Subunit: 116 residues, 4 copies
Amino acid sequence: MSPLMVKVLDAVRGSPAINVAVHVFRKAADDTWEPFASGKTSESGELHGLTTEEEFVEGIYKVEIDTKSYWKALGISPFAEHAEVVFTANDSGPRRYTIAALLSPYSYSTTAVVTN
Amino acid sequence: MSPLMVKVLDAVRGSPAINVAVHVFRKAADDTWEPFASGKTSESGELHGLTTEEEFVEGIYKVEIDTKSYWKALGISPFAEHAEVVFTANDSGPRRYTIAALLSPYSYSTTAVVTN
Amino acid sequence: MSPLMVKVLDAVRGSPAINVAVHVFRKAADDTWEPFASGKTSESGELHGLTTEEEFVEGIYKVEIDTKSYWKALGISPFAEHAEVVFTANDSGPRRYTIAALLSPYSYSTTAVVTN
Amino acid sequence: MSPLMVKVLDAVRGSPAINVAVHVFRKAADDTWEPFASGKTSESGELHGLTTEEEFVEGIYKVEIDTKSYWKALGISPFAEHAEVVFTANDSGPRRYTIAALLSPYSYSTTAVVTNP
Ligand SMILES: [Mg+2]
């Protein structure tokens, strides 16, 4: 399976957040953010298949979740453009990284869940 | 100033939640809940003056926040009925507790900032 | 499968919150809280099999997640006794309820995810 | 008073996060991020005086917070490496914004309370 997964909940409607675009970036040697993977959440609010064990090498990764487009599709103009998290992926730690985001228009949390 | 302050905010609108009823109870030695203090939030979403240092001794306190009436006044019939925060106070000596309840119709977040 | 499920994450350690006790109550005619179901989260932070479609009738339910014992087991001082979620189950309403809780010692959210 | 205020709190300790670096940028017409204002949170966890009602015009603003240094100064090595939020301000007239970042080592919450001047 992908070592990096994303799950998104809509805390206003009490449902998975479906069709949310997610972009992942990796810091390059020149300190710029290089695009790494993208996708959108399914009907369960999950995004699987972003990357592979081979490709998900150690590095600094940025996960950006496009929450503004999600809310705007529901008719709402929310506070932020995105939810984001930056973290270092490490070969020593637990293998699987799940970014869990809980969304409301004016408050949201992004949590990294690192497991085996 | 009251050693217990409660603030209520709306996560959907990004606004203070005004006129929200807040009821505080203290657990008695016989395990029942005794009414302890109550009030309604102000225009800033804050409820000041609930109690005093002299009254607010160690104990288990329950803060019940009438979130149902608040949503209903905005034309929403919420899923999350009433918010309830239960905590032990002053166990290491008197502290000032600010409890913030952030509301949506299907979720709430409770945050405590505890100072000297 | 149980029409009421609970999933719990630890935001301090970035992990599922394992072995968290959960107690569910249903409001009785005398306005008291009847014990209804209980269990504890598994290694995945999920609690399955709490109740059945037959047992879970309309009513007012309280889900208490025993977060104080969880933080004590980790050596981390907590704020609350537990996280509570009170809701009315109406038959016109939702078919499956999942309570998703994100926990830190001094801040926590509980979200009802209502699905079919 | 500044119509943009940023507050940072610690969800592990239940305390204000003191002396935390906060950077604010505003998106220019050429799509670059221009430095707008910065400072460090005070003993209440709040950073006051960032801007004024005259200077804080409509635009896209970015608030970036050095949460990693905050945790390290407390003896904690965090997993999340910073906090960052981008938002359009004053799109429907001037507002006052309080942005609160609530931190733990593996998570953060961003909340905006938006009021009239
Ligand atoms: Mg004692």
